Design a protein around this ligand. Structure first.
Ligand SMILES: Cc1cc2nc3c(=O)[nH]c(=O)nc-3n(C[C@H](O)[C@H](O)[C@H](O)CO)c2cc1C
Lengths: 134, 134
């Protein structure tokens, strides 16, 4: 009975990510704790307890120094898509997030499955934001 | 309100990823279809109907070929950590997973929070496998 509890999000700076996720997206801090130099910083939306996002530092030691530079570069250019956030109304969440300071790379567009928008976090990772259409 | 419904998993080849996730891990196929020339393929744990893992081809349309090549190299080198699977017993799951061809790169190890192992899929992406045992 394996289940997914957390999703790894590579971030450029943990303090900056923590602020973006909690103040801009309204997520809450589920863990913030350090063990052997590793800051275990996890966040999730207010409703969903089963799945957290791990805001994982990209740097020494868990990343080799060359590897780091290459990941950190792919992250800043928006190549890492974390996944899909499902909400009741994409246009409402769009405007809420946008009025806080979230940068959208795609405004809400109607798709066969719902209304979809695309935003990016503070590092440049992207999320699709989705509806079953209002 | 918000929840994370899909997690993106960058795969090298989709047919190969589908076998790994369904045959080795025992995940169920929640979606498999095409439109355009693009394959929407999602899988998930049996007991977790609310989260899908999107097995996304790293390749042309969606990724330019420079970016695509750089991410295929990172993926193949085990740089991309997808997330954390939670089980009742890491050591028993490690065993059951080893029985089908799952390659662990970290064996079960006692940590302040639980016992942790680390495996890789057929592309090279890695998962933490965790429990609450000491
Ligand atoms: C039948 C079909 C269903 C899809 N359903 C969804 C969906 O429910 N949510 C979603 O984010 N994307 C869905 N996608 C595609 C995906 O979001 C899209 O190709 C990328 O986000 C664009 O880069 C679907 C694609 C197909 C062909």
């Amino acid at each position: 009975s394996a289940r997914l509890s957390h999703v790894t999000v590579p971030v450029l700076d943990q303090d900056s990510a923590k602020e973006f996720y909690t103040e801009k997206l309204g997520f809450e801090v589920r863990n913030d704790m350090t063990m052997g130099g590793l800051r275990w910083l996890t966040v999730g939306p207010k409703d969903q307890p089963d799945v957290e996002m791990v805001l994982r530092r990209v740097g020494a030691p868990e990343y080799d120094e060359e590897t780091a530079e290459q990941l950190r570069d792919l992250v800043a250019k928006g190549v890492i898509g974390v996944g899909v956030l499902h909400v009741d109304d994409t246009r409402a969440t769009y405007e809420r997030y946008r009025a806080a300071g979230v940068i959208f790379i795609q405004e809400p567009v109607k798709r066969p499955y719902g209304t979809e928008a695309v935003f990016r976090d503070d590092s440049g990772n992207w999320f699709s934001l989705t509806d079953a259409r209002g």
